[PDB]
Design a binder for these strands. Structure first.
Lengths: 403, 87
RNA sequence: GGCGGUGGGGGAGCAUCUCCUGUAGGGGAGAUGUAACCCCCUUUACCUGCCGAACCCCGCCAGGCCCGGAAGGGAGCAACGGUAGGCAGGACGUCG
C-alpha cells in the first residue's frame, strides 16, 4: 500500500548512474522490484511475467535507445508496472440526458453502504444531482452512519425504517425522486458475504431498471482474492460492470488486489483512500504510480523522448527543415556529435541549450544578461560560452533562408 | 583544513555557507584578510586562488588551507575577531 | 445573467537566525516564519481543461558544474509537477 511504494522506489533508487549498467544491474532491481510486489501480495504469476518483460526489453533491445540510460529502465519498469495496475478505462460515463441509474453491489464487510454516500459526493462535484435509495436492509446504526452523510450533502435518499421490501421500496423512489435527479445511485447489495447470492438479489432489480452501470464495491484488504470476485461479476454483468476497490489504507495487501481486478478485464473506475469523502479520486493508473514510485511521474518524458525517433526521420526531418530555431539547432547538434565543431564544442553547445526555456529556444531574442547568466550558471559553463551559442545560432539563422 | 570565504561573509546567508554569527562576519572577506589573520595566529596558510565552493560552484572564490588540529568553529571566530579590528 | 472563491490545526519540508561538530563536500540540535507535499476538522468556496514568474516561488533534479583519490556529497538550470495568480466552462453559494 504505502510500504510497496516504500520498499519499491528503493529499486528505481538503485538506478543512479555511477557504474552504468553492464547488462545485469537491471536484474539486481528486478528480483526486488518484484518482491516488493509479491510482498505487496500480488498474484505471483502476474509478477514473474512482469519480471520477464523487462528482461526482453531492457537488456535486450535496450541501449540508451531513447531518454538515455538509467532513465530508460526506470521508464520501462513504469510503463509496464502500470499496465499491471490497469490498462486504462476509468472513463465513468455520466448522464446522456438528465437521468441515469447506477447500481451498487458488493459482499458484506466492504464499504458498500458508505461507498454509496461517497459516490454521491463525487457526482455532486462532477456537476450532477445524485439521489440514493437504500434498496436493502440496514442495521440500527447504518441509519446513524448514512443519512447523516446524505446530510453532509444535499443528497436525498429513500430509506425504509417502518415496513420494508425491495422491488418496490425501489420502484417508488425511482418513479419518485426524478423531480431533480440527474443521476440515481441505488444501494441494493443485500448483506451477503458471498458473491453468488450477491448476483441473484442483483437482477431481480436489473429487470426493474435498465442500469447504465453496475458497480462492485470490492475491498483492498481482501487482497488478491478481490479478483475472483471480479470475474464472477464480469461473467454475469453484460459489461456494464465496473469495480470500485476501497480501503486502500487499511492493509499491506491491496495494491496486490487491484492487480487482480486488473487481470480480469473488468474496469476499475474508483478507489478508496480513507473515510472522508475528500480523499476519494477516480482511478487512473499512471497517477497511482506517480503517487507510488514518487519522484518524477509520467509526463516527465514527452520532450526528451518525443524529439527522438529513428534518426532517419528526424535526421531527414530537418532536411526539408530549413528555417532556424534554437530547438532546431539542438536538433542539428544532435546529428553532428553523432553520425559525425570539435567534440567538446558539440557537447557544450548542446549542454547550454539544454538549459534554456521553450520560450527562450522558440524565437530566442528575449535573451539578455539576467537570463544569460542563469542558463550559463544552470549549465556549468560561462556567460561567454552561452553568448557563443547565441552567436553561432544568430549566424546559422541569418544564413539559413530560402529554398 | 580548508577555509572558504563563505564561512565568514556577512553578506552571504547561513544556507549559503556562513558559520559565524552576524557579529563577526566581515563584509567582503578576502583571502588576504584570511591568510593574514591566521598568520598573526601562528599558523602557516596557503592560498588557492582558484577553487570553488560547491554551494557557489559557479564562482572562483578560492580557499585557504591551514594545517590545524583544533576546533574549526573557533578558529573561524578567531579569524573574524582579528579582522574587524584593522587600523 | 451578474457577482463570489472560506477560515484553520498536525507534522514532513523549505526560508532566515542561533548553537555545537568534522583536519573538504559535510553532520547534529533548536528557535521563528510559511502558501507548495501528507493527513484531519470547517466552509458553497470545490471540480475539468488550458496557461502560470526564466531565475531572486516550491518539489524534482537529466545533463552540465563544484568539493573529493574515491566512495559520496553540494549548489542547481531546463523538462516535469506544483504554489501564489489567470483564461475558460461546469457545479455549489449569493443576488445585497
Amino acid at each position: 500500500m504505502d510500504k510497496l511504494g516504500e520498499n519499491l522506489n528503493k529499486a528505481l533508487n538503485k538506478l543512479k548512474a555511477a557504474a552504468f549498467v553492464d547488462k545485469k544491474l537491471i536484474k539486481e532491481v528486478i528480483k526486488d522490484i518484484q518482491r516488493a510486489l509479491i510482498q505487496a501480495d500480488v498474484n505471483v504469476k502476474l509478477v514473474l511475467k512482469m519480471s520477464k518483460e523487462i528482461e526482453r526489453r531492457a537488456l535486450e533491445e535496450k541501449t540508451p535507445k531513447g531518454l538515455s540510460k538509467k532513465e530508460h529502465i526506470i521508464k520501462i519498469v513504469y510503463e509496464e508496472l502500470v499496465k499491471l495496475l490497469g490498462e486504462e478505462a476509468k472513463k465513468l460515463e455520466l448522464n446522456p440526458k438528465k437521468q441515469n441509474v447506477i447500481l451498487l453491489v458488493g459482499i458484506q464487510g466492504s464499504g458498500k453502504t458508505t461507498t454509496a454516500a461517497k459516490l454521491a459526493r463525487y457526482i455532486q462535484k462532477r456537476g450532477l444531482k445524485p439521489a440514493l435509495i437504500a434498496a436493502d436492509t440496514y442495521r440500527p446504526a447504518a441509519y446513524e452512519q448514512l443519512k447523516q452523510l446524505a446530510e453532509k450533502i444535499h443528497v436525498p435518499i429513500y430509506g425504509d425504517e417502518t415496513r420494508t421490501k425491495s422491488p418496490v421500496d425501489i420502484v417508488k423512489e425511482g418513479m419518485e425522486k426524478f423531480k431533480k435527479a440527474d443521476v440515481l445511485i441505488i444501494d441494493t447489495a443485500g448483506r451477503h458475504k458471498e458473491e453468488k447470492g450477491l448476483l441473484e438479489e442483483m437482477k431481480q432489480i436489473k429487470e426493474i431498471t435498465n442500469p447504465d452501470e453496475i458497480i462492485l464495491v470490492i475491498d483492498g484488504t481482501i487482497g488478491q482474492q478481490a479478483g475472483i470476485q471480479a470475474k464472477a461479476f464480469k461473467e454475469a454483468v453484460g459489461e456494464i460492470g465496473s469495480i470500485i476497490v476501497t480501503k486502500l489504507d487499511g492493509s499491506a495487501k491491496g495494491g496486490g488486489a487491484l492487480s487482480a481486478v486488473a487481470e480480469t478485464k473488468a474496469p476499475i473506475k474508483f478507489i478508496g483512500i480513507g473515510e472522508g469523502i475528500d480523499d476519494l479520486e477516480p482511478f487512473d493508473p499512471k497517477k497511482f504510480i506517480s503517487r507510488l514510485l514518487g519522484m518524477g511521474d509520467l509526463e516527465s518524458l514527452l520532450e526528451k523522448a518525443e524529439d527522438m525517433v529513428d534518426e532517419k526521420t528526424e535526421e531527414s526531418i530537418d532536411a526539408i527543415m530549413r528555417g532556424k530555431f534554437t530547438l532546431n539547432e539542438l536538433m542539428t547538434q544532435l546529428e553532428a556529435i553523432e553520425n559525425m565543431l570539435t567534440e567538446a564544442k558539440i557537447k557544450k553547445y548542446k549542454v547550454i541549450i539544454s538549459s534554456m526555456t521553450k520560450e527562450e529556444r522558440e524565437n530566442p531574442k528575449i535573451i539578455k544578461a539576467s537570463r544569460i547568466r542563469r542558463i550559463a550558471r544552470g549549465s556549468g559553463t560561462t556567460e561567454n560560452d552561452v553568448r557563443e551559442v547565441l552567436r553561432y545560432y544568430e549566424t546559422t539563422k541569418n544564413a539559413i533562408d530560402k529554398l | 583544513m580548508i577555509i572558504w570565504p563563505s564561512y565568514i561573509d556577512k553578506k552571504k546567508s547561513r544556507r549559503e555557507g556562513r558559520k559565524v554569527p552576524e557579529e563577526l562576519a566581515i563584509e567582503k572577506p578576502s583571502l588576504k584578510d584570511i591568510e593574514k589573520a591566521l598568520k598573526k595566529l601562528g599558523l602557516e596558510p596557503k592560498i588557492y586562488r582558484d577553487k570553488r565552493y560547491p554551494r557557489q560552484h559557479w564562482e572562483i572564490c578560492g580557499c585557504v588551507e591551514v594545517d590545524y588540529k583544533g576546533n574549526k568553529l573557533q578558529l573561524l571566530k578567531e579569524i573574524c575577531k582579528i579582522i574587524k579590528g584593522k587600523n
